[PDB]
Amino acid sequence: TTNTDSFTFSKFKPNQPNLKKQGDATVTSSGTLQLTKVDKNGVPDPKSLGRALYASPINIWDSKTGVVASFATSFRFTIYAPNIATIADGLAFFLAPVSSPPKAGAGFLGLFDSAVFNSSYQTVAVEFDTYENTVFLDPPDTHIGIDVNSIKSIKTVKWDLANGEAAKVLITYDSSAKLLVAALVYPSSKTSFILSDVVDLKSVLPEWVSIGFSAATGASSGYIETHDVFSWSFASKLSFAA
Amino acid sequence: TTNTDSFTFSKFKPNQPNLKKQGDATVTSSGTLQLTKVDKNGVPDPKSLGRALYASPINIWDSKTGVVASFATSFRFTIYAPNIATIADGLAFFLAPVSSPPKAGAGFLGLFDSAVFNSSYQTVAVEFDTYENTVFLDPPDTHIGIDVNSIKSIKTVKWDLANGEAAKVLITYDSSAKLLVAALVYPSSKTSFILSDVVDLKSVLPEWVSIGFSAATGASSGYIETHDVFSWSFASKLSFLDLASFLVAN
Amino acid sequence: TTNTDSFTFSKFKPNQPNLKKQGDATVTSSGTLQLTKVDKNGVPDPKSLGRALYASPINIWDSKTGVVASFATSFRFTIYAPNIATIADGLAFFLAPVSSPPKAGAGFLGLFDSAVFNSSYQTVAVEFDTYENTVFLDPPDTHIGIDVNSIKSIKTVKWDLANGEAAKVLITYDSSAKLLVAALVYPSSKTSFILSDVVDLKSVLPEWVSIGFSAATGASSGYIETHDVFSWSFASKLSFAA
Amino acid sequence: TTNTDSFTFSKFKPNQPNLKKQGDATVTSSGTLQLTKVDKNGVPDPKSLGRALYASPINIWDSKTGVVASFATSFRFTIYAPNIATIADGLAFFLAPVSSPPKAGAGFLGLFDSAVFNSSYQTVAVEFDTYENTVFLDPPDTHIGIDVNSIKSIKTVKWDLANGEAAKVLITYDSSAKLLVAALVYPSSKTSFILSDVVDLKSVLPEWVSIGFSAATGASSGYIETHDVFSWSFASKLSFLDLASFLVAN
Ligand SMILES: *[C@@H]1O[C@H](CO)[C@@H](O[C@@H]2O[C@H](CO)[C@@H](O[C@@H]3O[C@H](CO)[C@@H](O)[C@H](O[C@H]4O[C@H](CO)[C@@H](O)[C@H](O)[C@@H]4O)[C@@H]3O)[C@H](O)[C@H]2NC(C)=O)[C@H](O[C@@H]2O[C@@H](C)[C@@H](O)[C@@H](O)[C@@H]2O)[C@H]1NC(C)=O
Ligand SMILES: *[C@@H]1O[C@H](CO)[C@@H](O[C@@H]2O[C@H](CO)[C@@H](O[C@@H]3O[C@H](CO)[C@@H](O)[C@H](O)[C@@H]3O)[C@H](O)[C@H]2NC(C)=O)[C@H](O[C@@H]2O[C@@H](C)[C@@H](O)[C@@H](O)[C@@H]2O)[C@H]1NC(C)=O
Ligand SMILES: *[C@@H]1O[C@H](CO)[C@@H](O[C@@H]2O[C@H](CO)[C@@H](O[C@@H]3O[C@H](CO)[C@@H](O)[C@H](O)[C@@H]3O)[C@H](O)[C@H]2NC(C)=O)[C@H](O[C@@H]2O[C@@H](C)[C@@H](O)[C@@H](O)[C@@H]2O)[C@H]1NC(C)=O
Ligand SMILES: *[C@@H]1O[C@H](CO)[C@@H](O)[C@H](O)[C@H]1NC(C)=O
Ligand SMILES: [Ca+2]
Ligand SMILES: [Ca+2]
Ligand SMILES: [Ca+2]
Ligand SMILES: [Ca+2]
Ligand SMILES: [Mn+2]
Ligand SMILES: [Mn+2]
Ligand SMILES: [Mn+2]
Ligand SMILES: [Mn+2]
């Protein structure tokens, strides 16, 4: 007995009513979702935080039956950094409760308030982290991480940013294997990165979540980068028994 | 460059935050979308009026390119009347300005305010109409209508209500033919009906539209019927559909 | 446990190896599947017979579990008759056993051998009949028909031929309702026909069936028309414990 | 103006005529496609090679229009080895011309006849390689690799085999960026591997190609492992795929 919800934005459009935008999020004339503040020149600013949600909650689990949804989302994104040596803070795909407020900037990625684990967050996220928060146990490498009610990622893998180049991303969740899987590929320069782990979405998330993007820039001048999104598809399936 | 927005409600849930319940519209505990009001008794009430819309506007055409969405939807619904001789007024699947407010009850079907045509409605519907308003040029028989900016359907055809029986609808809009088609089947009765006509969606809708059901029961006590929706499926693409593949399992 | 097989021919190409063509059927330069003989000049010929099948069998029902496929097919076809008053014989979408040869021409539609019902035809069809075979209890009008192990339709509805316009067809089988529905629209005329009936696929087909088209022109001189298909899409779904 | 062709085998079934079996490929009565010979015990035999292709050719590209197909494919497979430390040879998913004979075994994986690259193979493969063949430039570790007309990969990455555990694979081709990607995840060990390269196909493969799997065991006793496939979906679009939807509908 399956519900499904899916959409594909191959462009973005100014003021799109199917998209909830938060903090600094703009969608440009040219169709770019500009998650984080970027002046006329292309020049990203500090002290920024931006978010994008799909306008309707996704039913990721069902308490009557205990059935859990599988989902798959795909997106393409570009991090340009004026200076690659100083980069902060990163972007992320997440699933948080609905009407849940944006949270601290920088390392927090606009999804947390603190280094502390808290089951209250009810956030699961795949981060693309570009600055090392030693305070958070970040690997020293810029990384893909999987967060579960904590910015202190449960598992991380290296990810070598290709500055200004477009990354194609696939994020997967098999509900019967409880497997969350994230893969990033640079089409131009042909590199590849994968991270996978087990997350039991029912003990973590509410039945209904907002899905979308979060992004932050550095708390320090020069520690700046864009977080531009070009396209985004998603598809979730919630079957009620076998 | 193709956008797609799409979904399946095969079962409904109370309070479902991805739909916008308006008027009396609710979803019971066992999953039925009651568009229009029903006592626990199971007795349908008069002067009810309810709508359900998907909470996400749909991009139906793009002004910059001129490009227009194709779309498909299907659902399963029952109208049950305690008294088949006194049945009012109907239900409808529609597109309208985001997220439109319900308009007059009764034979207006929550979609219109009078018998006259008006472009500001910006509304296009397929009605499944159950009471003959002669001031709306209604045919004597129960009928499926296509309606554009008016309650006076621009084309109707016969529909024989099977009282208390689930009908399966496929409504369909091929953008290159500007073709709207509504098919209705009762699998229990083996009976079927189709209406087909053109409507140039770009002429009559805004770029963004809210999609849903609308239903009303009668303006006099006893003209009464349910307008229950069991399941619902929708799919659109806008390029700046694969229908076979869409039904066989949406 | 759901298997699925699906495709779309948005146009045909000559000797494309995923169709098997039988009889006179061929694919033209401009990508048309002419089921029946049309000459040099567009003049269709009599005594012609053509079938075009998907080169893969379709698992219609599973005997071990007794479950049965749902499937949906859509196609676009033109028949054009140079004399509207003298047209024959029709076309058909059908399911039948594999390596099951073409069968009698004319009014049997490449699908049968006599008037009589016969179980061992193991054939199910939706037909688009342009000539009254009185001998087959044909209605006195061009009709659409459901046929199950007989050219004697188990049900019909009136179909109004629109000479030389493309017809859009949607045929659909719902194995939970055991419900076969055929709809035909002409975009040009705005016209619309539907036929709906119960058919037990599990009763009348084997587990695997070829799926395709059959068509035939009239017997006598003059009872001629074309039977041209432009596009075809099929999808089926066979869940073992649904 | 877009063609399509997809399927999903969640089970395999004995004899299944939409699947063409070559060499030793057997489908177990419990549903496993056994690419290479697996005896009574369940003990894999050496000296084996098997292949299973989809029974109909796939249109990968069109010469008239020069347009080229995109495609996803996923599958579950298990390699079981009685001694983890004597293992050969490997399995692959390939695209070769119809109706390609199966070719040399062992480290050639049933796809190639020798170390030599050849254009007239018109074979592209994603390889799962379990034995180092120095004659083919194999890296010291077990690896996934992209093969184009040759048993010598154009690129590889360390694949660490988890013995007896189902691997889930995703293979994609983006014709728009001539880019082929293989990824494998062992859901039990939460462990993963991904491999990206550019390969044209228009220049390398015919318009029509058969597709499936190929496998082989070692050339000497004891160098043995199974190559068992549990499910398989495939999707191809060629305009003259929405992967996110593909995966979650398998
Ligand atoms: C529904 O479908 C089946 C087809 O599967 C028909 O049954 C078959 O009919 C054929 C043709 O009549 C029979 O073949 C016969 O088999 C015997 C040996 O078993 C042959 O020798 C025989 O030939 C003799 O007759 C010939 C013509 O008279 C000569 O040329 C030969 O010399 C030879 O002397 C012929 O090939 C099948 O055996 C029969 N199959 C089965 C499984 O029964 C149905 O036909 C009906 O039933 C038949 C028994 C027969 O009596 C027909 O007259 C019936 O139509 C067919 N049913 C209907 C209603 O059409
Ligand atoms: C579409 O619906 C709109 C809004 O309902 C119609 O506009 C209304 O039309 C009436 C004209 O018959 C107007 O009557 C007036 O009432 C006011 C006081 O409230 C008086 O001061 C005035 O003397 C009129 O009698 C009404 O004003 C008007 N409402 C609004 C909000 O403008 C509309 O009718 C069409 O446009 C309007 C503005 C007039 O020009 C009409 O003549 C015209 O037909 C509806 N359109 C159609 C095509 O039916
Ligand atoms: C790469 O792949 C091509 C195509 O298979 C190879 O060419 C083929 O080689 C075969 C010999 O190994 C040729 O077949 C023989 O033809 C003669 C003449 O009738 C027969 O008497 C004999 O018994 C064989 O059937 C085959 O003709 C040829 N195929 C084609 C399509 O031309 C190719 O091998 C190289 O080219 C040929 C001309 C011979 O010189 C070979 O020795 C040769 O290596 C393969 N390339 C390599 C480097 O291995
Ligand atoms: C978690 O969050 C809530 C409010 O958001 C707070 O009351 C609580 O103290 C939190 N921290 C921990 C460690 O539980
Ligand atoms: Ca960090
Ligand atoms: Ca009415
Ligand atoms: Ca006839
Ligand atoms: Ca090797
Ligand atoms: Mn981190
Ligand atoms: Mn009406
Ligand atoms: Mn007939
Ligand atoms: Mn290798």
Coordinates of N, CA and C in Angstrom, one line a residue, chain A residues 85-197:
Chain A
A85 N 42.6 28.0 0.0 CA 43.3 27.7 1.3 C 42.4 28.1 2.5
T86 N 41.6 29.1 2.3 CA 40.7 29.5 3.4 C 39.2 29.2 3.0
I87 N 38.7 28.1 3.4 CA 37.4 27.7 3.0 C 36.5 27.3 4.2
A88 N 35.3 27.8 4.2 CA 34.3 27.5 5.2 C 32.9 27.9 4.7
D89 N 31.8 27.4 5.2 CA 31.8 26.2 6.1 C 31.3 24.9 5.5
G90 N 30.4 25.1 4.6 CA 29.9 24.0 3.8 C 28.4 24.0 3.5
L91 N 27.9 23.0 2.8 CA 26.5 22.8 2.5 C 26.0 21.4 3.0
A92 N 24.7 21.1 2.9 CA 24.1 19.9 3.3 C 22.7 19.7 2.8
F93 N 22.4 18.4 2.5 CA 21.0 17.9 2.4 C 20.5 17.4 3.7
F94 N 19.3 17.8 4.1 CA 18.8 17.4 5.4 C 17.3 17.1 5.4
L95 N 16.9 16.5 6.5 CA 15.5 16.1 6.8 C 15.3 16.5 8.3
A96 N 14.5 17.5 8.5 CA 14.3 18.1 9.9 C 12.8 18.1 10.1
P97 N 12.4 18.3 11.4 CA 10.9 18.5 11.5 C 10.5 19.7 10.7
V98 N 9.2 19.8 10.5 CA 8.5 20.9 9.8 C 8.4 22.1 10.7
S99 N 8.4 23.3 10.2 CA 8.3 24.6 11.0 C 9.4 24.6 12.0
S100 N 10.5 23.9 11.7 CA 11.7 23.8 12.5 C 12.7 24.9 12.1
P101 N 13.0 25.8 13.0 CA 13.8 27.0 12.7 C 15.3 26.8 12.3
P102 N 15.9 27.5 11.3 CA 17.3 27.5 11.0 C 18.2 27.8 12.2
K103 N 19.4 27.3 12.3 CA 20.1 27.2 13.5 C 21.5 27.7 13.2
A104 N 22.5 27.6 14.2 CA 23.7 28.4 14.2 C 24.4 28.3 12.8
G105 N 25.1 29.4 12.4 CA 25.9 29.4 11.2 C 27.3 28.8 11.3
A106 N 28.1 29.0 10.3 CA 29.5 28.4 10.3 C 29.3 26.8 10.5
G107 N 30.3 26.3 11.2 CA 30.4 24.8 11.4 C 29.1 24.1 11.6
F108 N 28.2 24.8 12.2 CA 26.9 24.2 12.5 C 26.1 24.0 11.2
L109 N 26.4 24.6 10.1 CA 25.9 24.4 8.8 C 24.4 24.8 8.7
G110 N 24.0 25.6 9.7 CA 22.6 26.1 9.8 C 21.7 25.1 10.3
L111 N 22.2 23.9 10.8 CA 21.4 22.8 11.3 C 21.5 22.5 12.8
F112 N 22.6 23.0 13.4 CA 22.8 22.7 14.9 C 23.1 24.0 15.6
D113 N 23.2 23.9 16.9 CA 23.4 25.1 17.7 C 24.7 25.0 18.4
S114 N 25.3 23.7 18.4 CA 26.3 23.4 19.4 C 27.0 22.1 19.0
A115 N 28.1 21.8 19.6 CA 28.9 20.6 19.3 C 28.2 19.4 19.9
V116 N 27.3 19.6 20.8 CA 26.5 18.6 21.6 C 25.5 17.8 20.8
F117 N 25.5 16.5 20.9 CA 24.5 15.6 20.5 C 23.2 15.9 21.2
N118 N 22.1 16.0 20.5 CA 20.7 16.2 21.1 C 19.7 15.5 20.2
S119 N 19.0 14.5 20.8 CA 18.0 13.8 20.0 C 16.9 14.7 19.5
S120 N 16.6 15.8 20.3 CA 15.7 16.9 19.9 C 15.9 17.4 18.5
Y121 N 17.1 17.7 18.0 CA 17.3 18.1 16.6 C 16.4 17.4 15.6
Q122 N 16.3 16.1 15.7 CA 15.5 15.3 14.8 C 15.9 15.5 13.4
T123 N 17.2 15.7 13.2 CA 17.8 16.0 12.0 C 18.7 14.8 11.5
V124 N 18.5 14.4 10.3 CA 19.5 13.6 9.7 C 20.0 14.4 8.5
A125 N 21.3 14.4 8.3 CA 21.9 15.2 7.2 C 23.2 14.6 6.7
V126 N 23.4 14.8 5.4 CA 24.6 14.4 4.7 C 25.3 15.8 4.4
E127 N 26.4 16.0 5.1 CA 27.2 17.2 4.9 C 28.3 17.2 3.9
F128 N 28.6 18.3 3.3 CA 29.7 18.6 2.4 C 30.4 19.7 3.2
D129 N 31.4 19.3 4.0 CA 32.1 20.1 5.0 C 33.5 20.5 4.5
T130 N 33.8 21.8 4.6 CA 34.9 22.4 3.9 C 35.9 23.0 4.9
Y131 N 35.6 22.9 6.2 CA 36.4 23.6 7.2 C 36.5 22.7 8.4
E132 N 37.7 22.5 9.0 CA 37.8 21.6 10.1 C 37.5 22.2 11.4
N133 N 36.4 21.7 12.1 CA 36.0 22.1 13.4 C 36.5 20.9 14.3
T134 N 37.6 21.2 15.0 CA 38.3 20.3 15.8 C 37.4 20.0 17.1
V135 N 36.8 21.1 17.5 CA 35.7 21.2 18.4 C 34.6 20.2 18.1
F136 N 34.4 19.8 16.8 CA 33.4 18.8 16.4 C 33.9 17.4 16.1
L137 N 35.2 17.2 16.2 CA 35.9 16.0 15.7 C 35.9 15.8 14.2
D138 N 35.8 17.0 13.4 CA 36.0 16.9 12.0 C 37.3 16.2 11.6
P139 N 37.3 15.3 10.6 CA 38.5 15.0 10.0 C 39.2 16.2 9.5
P140 N 40.6 16.2 9.4 CA 41.3 17.4 8.9 C 41.0 17.7 7.4
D141 N 40.6 16.6 6.7 CA 40.3 16.6 5.3 C 39.0 17.2 5.1
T142 N 38.8 17.9 4.0 CA 37.4 18.3 3.7 C 36.7 17.1 3.3
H143 N 35.4 17.0 3.7 CA 34.7 15.7 3.8 C 33.2 15.7 3.6
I144 N 32.8 14.5 3.2 CA 31.4 14.1 3.2 C 31.1 13.4 4.5
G145 N 30.1 13.9 5.3 CA 29.8 13.3 6.6 C 28.3 13.0 6.7
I146 N 27.9 12.0 7.6 CA 26.5 11.7 7.8 C 26.2 12.1 9.3
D147 N 25.3 13.1 9.4 CA 25.0 13.6 10.8 C 23.6 13.1 11.2
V148 N 23.6 12.7 12.5 CA 22.4 12.2 13.2 C 22.3 12.9 14.5
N149 N 21.5 14.0 14.6 CA 21.3 14.8 15.8 C 22.5 15.3 16.4
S150 N 23.5 15.6 15.6 CA 24.8 16.1 16.0 C 25.6 16.5 14.8
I151 N 26.2 17.6 14.8 CA 27.2 18.0 13.8 C 28.5 17.2 13.9
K152 N 28.6 16.5 15.0 CA 29.7 15.6 15.1 C 29.3 14.3 14.4
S153 N 29.7 14.3 13.1 CA 29.4 13.3 12.2 C 29.6 11.8 12.6
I154 N 28.7 10.9 12.5 CA 28.9 9.5 12.8 C 29.9 8.8 11.9
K155 N 30.0 9.2 10.6 CA 31.0 8.7 9.7 C 31.3 9.6 8.6
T156 N 32.6 9.8 8.3 CA 33.0 10.7 7.3 C 33.9 10.0 6.2
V157 N 33.8 10.5 5.0 CA 34.9 10.1 4.0 C 35.5 11.4 3.3
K158 N 36.8 11.2 2.9 CA 37.4 12.3 2.2 C 36.6 12.8 1.0
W159 N 36.7 14.0 0.7 CA 36.1 14.6 -0.5 C 36.9 15.7 -0.9
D160 N 37.6 15.5 -2.1 CA 38.4 16.6 -2.6 C 37.6 17.5 -3.5
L161 N 37.3 18.7 -2.9 CA 36.7 19.8 -3.7 C 37.4 20.0 -5.0
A162 N 36.6 20.2 -6.1 CA 37.1 20.7 -7.3 C 36.4 22.1 -7.4
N163 N 37.2 23.1 -7.0 CA 36.8 24.5 -6.9 C 36.2 25.0 -8.1
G164 N 35.0 25.6 -8.0 CA 34.2 26.1 -9.2 C 33.6 25.0 -10.1
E165 N 34.0 23.7 -10.0 CA 33.4 22.7 -10.8 C 32.1 22.1 -10.3
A166 N 31.3 21.6 -11.2 CA 30.0 21.1 -10.8 C 30.0 19.7 -10.3
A167 N 29.4 19.4 -9.1 CA 29.4 18.1 -8.6 C 28.0 17.6 -8.8
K168 N 27.9 16.4 -9.4 CA 26.7 15.6 -9.4 C 26.7 14.6 -8.2
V169 N 25.6 14.7 -7.4 CA 25.4 13.9 -6.2 C 24.2 13.0 -6.2
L170 N 24.4 11.7 -5.7 CA 23.3 10.9 -5.5 C 23.2 10.5 -4.0
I171 N 22.0 10.6 -3.4 CA 21.8 10.2 -2.0 C 20.7 9.3 -2.0
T172 N 21.0 8.2 -1.3 CA 20.1 7.1 -1.3 C 19.7 6.6 0.1
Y173 N 18.5 6.1 0.3 CA 18.1 5.5 1.5 C 17.2 4.2 1.3
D174 N 17.8 3.1 1.5 CA 17.1 1.8 1.4 C 16.5 1.5 2.8
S175 N 15.2 1.5 3.0 CA 14.6 1.4 4.3 C 14.7 0.0 4.9
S176 N 14.7 -1.1 4.0 CA 14.8 -2.4 4.5 C 16.3 -2.8 4.9
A177 N 17.2 -2.1 4.3 CA 18.6 -2.2 4.8 C 19.0 -1.1 5.8
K178 N 18.1 -0.2 6.1 CA 18.4 1.0 6.8 C 19.7 1.7 6.3
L179 N 19.9 1.7 5.0 CA 21.2 2.1 4.5 C 21.1 3.5 3.9
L180 N 22.0 4.4 4.3 CA 22.0 5.7 3.8 C 23.3 5.8 3.0
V181 N 23.2 6.3 1.8 CA 24.4 6.2 0.9 C 24.5 7.5 0.2
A182 N 25.7 8.1 0.2 CA 26.0 9.3 -0.5 C 27.3 9.2 -1.4
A183 N 27.0 9.7 -2.7 CA 28.0 9.6 -3.7 C 28.2 11.0 -4.4
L184 N 29.4 11.4 -4.5 CA 29.7 12.6 -5.2 C 30.6 12.4 -6.4
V185 N 30.3 12.9 -7.6 CA 31.2 12.7 -8.8 C 31.4 14.1 -9.5
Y186 N 32.6 14.3 -9.8 CA 33.0 15.4 -10.7 C 33.1 14.9 -12.1
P187 N 32.1 15.3 -12.9 CA 32.0 14.8 -14.4 C 33.3 15.3 -15.1
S188 N 33.7 16.5 -14.9 CA 34.8 17.2 -15.5 C 36.0 17.1 -14.5
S189 N 36.9 16.2 -14.8 CA 38.0 15.8 -13.8 C 37.7 14.4 -13.2
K190 N 36.6 13.9 -13.4 CA 36.3 12.5 -13.2 C 36.7 11.8 -11.9
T191 N 36.4 12.5 -10.8 CA 36.6 11.9 -9.5 C 35.3 11.5 -8.9
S192 N 35.4 10.8 -7.7 CA 34.4 9.9 -7.2 C 34.6 9.8 -5.8
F193 N 33.5 9.8 -5.0 CA 33.6 9.7 -3.6 C 32.3 9.1 -3.0
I194 N 32.5 8.1 -2.1 CA 31.3 7.5 -1.5 C 31.4 7.2 0.0
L195 N 30.3 7.2 0.6 CA 30.2 7.1 2.1 C 28.9 6.4 2.3
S196 N 28.9 5.4 3.2 CA 27.7 4.7 3.5 C 27.6 4.3 4.9
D197 N 26.3 4.2 5.4 CA 26.2 3.8 6.8 C 24.7 3.4 7.1

